[PDB]
Design a protein around this ligand. Structure first.
Ligand SMILES: C[n+]1cn([C@@H]2O[C@H](COP(=O)(O)OP(=O)(O)OP(=O)(O)OC[C@H]3O[C@@H](n4cnc5c(=O)[nH]c(N)nc54)[C@H](O)[C@@H]3O)[C@@H](O)[C@H]2O)c2nc(N)[nH]c(=O)c21
Ligand SMILES: C[n+]1cn([C@@H]2O[C@H](COP(=O)(O)OP(=O)(O)OP(=O)(O)OC[C@H]3O[C@@H](n4cnc5c(=O)[nH]c(N)nc54)[C@H](O)[C@@H]3O)[C@@H](O)[C@H]2O)c2nc(N)[nH]c(=O)c21
Ligand SMILES: [Y+3]
Ligand SMILES: [Y+3]
Ligand SMILES: [Y+3]
Lengths: 300, 297
């Protein structure tokens, strides 16, 4: 049965980000303005065109589609095609209420690289962690079985080395070409790559190997078809591991943010304090006060 | 108004990108008309970008949604919009030749984790017995070709390099800035050949390359993603310099290795790149792939 948006009204305030490459748009709206004090609340709505399902397209092309001709020369032609309902799914994500930090995170990237030494992290980034971080209530809801419980693909229930593997928020689950799952560990308080020590080795291994094996069983997708990594910086500071189809150029899979789990494990095995001592490189928005702070300590 | 053929039997997905929302299909057409004799067609379909005004108006109307899930402040849905937002850009090549098929065909990729032993025992012998020609590189290094495109050169034959635009950058804007640095010293095949003896050369590429980009384009270094491919397509050490804001093809974690970190790894771990396992993707029809998989079973 069809539902509604979880608020009334949407009045556009700002296009936060738009891209013709992946055909996505991120909108900041005011919602629920006819109640209470009348100022309404902030919501983010993300709309993304979906990947094609090849069998449905071939079936369309076999018939008489609704078309307009845009270009035509000799053996080459371009049309505008207007498919029937089934091919028209738009993937819609809603963040509501959206905080100021959400609004900042999605906004128009003017990004800059920074190389963060271990000491920068300990002295500058860690103390200012709160401002970088979004609520992880959603993570607790999965781990506590209060949301997404029927989406769990695999769970190792061990309170220290265990994890839950679920389809990622970004994936609409309708085809395997952009397969994307997230694994969140049961153990609390591992903020990021920086907290990782050899004590986490059994946890990391179970994520990598039991995650791959669960994906093989559920989706028939082999491990050499997967690109499995974490982000630094993450947006949610509870360790989370992304399992993506290798054939999908996943957004956020760039060398300036993604770190392969197999390699994180081998670094820990070669070098116990690798993630507390070494320098990690990532991108921050140009006006991010953390950037300013990090730049300042990099001469002063 | 009509497709230039009738009927479509799918033959192969030649290529697709679930990130770019495009697919390239080889079909047989006219199989159930004229003769029975099917002709070849390529049809490329691409989703269209959103227009702000159409989306804002759809959303104020409280629209047509099917819940995927919700958790806390987060929820996701399938939305089936009115016709105006559903446009698919459809490109037809008809009749298609075998040369068109070849142009779009792309092999699927498979991941491989190459040990230090794997490289010594399998990969390097395979490389010794044939690779893509690096004549174009030699020709640049000694100015027979592309001397009119040089952005910067350090002539030192051990520790120097030429910095030049990459062929795929049309140079008309900074948004997609793409340059390549090629070292003067011969016989550094890739990352696997790197030792602390290369540190002067790596540091030069990083530091003088950023300088050059700064004087040439006014682009500061913290705007730059600077890295090597592994595997490279050409086996003569080359470093890529792209605008950070450009999500460049080949800058993914499964291929790209930041130059600054490669330098720091050498400082910390002299033999890193001969001993440690490196991870890359190969085309499913690459002879090296079956070689490595056989070795590893
Ligand atoms: C709230 N929530 C989040 N996820 C998942 O948790 C991970 C946290 O990663 P993370 O902390 O490493 O960093 P992110 O910046 O979040 O990575 P991310 O947002 O992936 O950033 C990478 C890039 O993708 C871009 N992006 C964000 N959404 C989309 C999208 O829907 N489509 C496309 N094409 N790009 C998107 C974004 O601009 C950024 O450059 C992410 O994978 C979330 O989807 C959730 N998964 C489930 N099942 N349930 C939830 O309630 C939930
Ligand atoms: C010949 N040439 C190349 N470049 C640049 O040097 C860098 C080498 O990087 P690299 O050695 O790290 O390898 P790639 O980035 O994979 O390179 P790439 O050239 O993309 O190598 C791949 C090629 O093989 C082809 N290819 C890629 N995938 C497939 C596939 O799946 N199937 C088939 N059949 N072909 C494929 C593809 O068309 C492409 O031409 C790159 O940035 C090049 O653009 C050149 N630059 C200048 N200034 N002058 C030149 O003459 C010149
Ligand atoms: Y108020
Ligand atoms: Y008021
Ligand atoms: Y089927």
């Amino acid at each position: 049965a069809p539902v509604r948006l979880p608020f009334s009204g949407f009045r556009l305030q700002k296009v936060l980000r738009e891209s013709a490459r992946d055909k996505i748009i991120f909108l900041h709206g005011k919602v629920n303005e006819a109640s209470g004090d009348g100022d309404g609340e902030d919501a983010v709505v993300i709309l993304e065109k979906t990947p094609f399902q090849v069998e449905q397209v071939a079936q369309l092309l076999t018939g008489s589609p609704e078309l307009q001709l845009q270009f035509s020369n000799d053996i080459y032609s371009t049309y505008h095609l207007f498919p029937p309902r089934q091919l028209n799914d738009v993937k819609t994500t809603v963040v509501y209420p959206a905080t100021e930090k959400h609004l900042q995170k999605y906004l128009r990237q003017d990004l800059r690289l920074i190389r963060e030494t271990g000491d920068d992290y300990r002295n500058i980034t860690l103390p200012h962690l709160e401002s970088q971080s979004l609520s992880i209530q959603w993570v607790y809801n999965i781990l506590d079985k209060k949301a997404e419980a029927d989406r769990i693909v695999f769970e190792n229930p061990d309170p220290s080395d265990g994890f839950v593997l679920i389809p990622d928020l970004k994936w609409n689950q309708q085809q395997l070409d952009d397969l994307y799952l997230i694994a969140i560990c049961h153990r609390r308080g591992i903020r990021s790559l920086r907290d990782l020590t050899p004590e986490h080795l059994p946890l990391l291994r179970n994520i990598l190997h039991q995650g791959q094996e669960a994906i093989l069983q559920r989706y028939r997708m082999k491990g050499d078809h997967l690109r499995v990594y974490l982000h630094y910086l993450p947006s949610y500071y509870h360790l989370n591991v992304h399992f993506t189809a290798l054939g999908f150029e996943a957004p956020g899979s760039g060398v300036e943010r993604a770190h392969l789990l197999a390699e994180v494990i081998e670094n820990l095995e070669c070098d116990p304090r690798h993630y507390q001592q070494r320098t990690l490189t990532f991108a921050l928005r140009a006006d991010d006060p953390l950037l300013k702070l990090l730049q300042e300590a990099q001469q002063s």
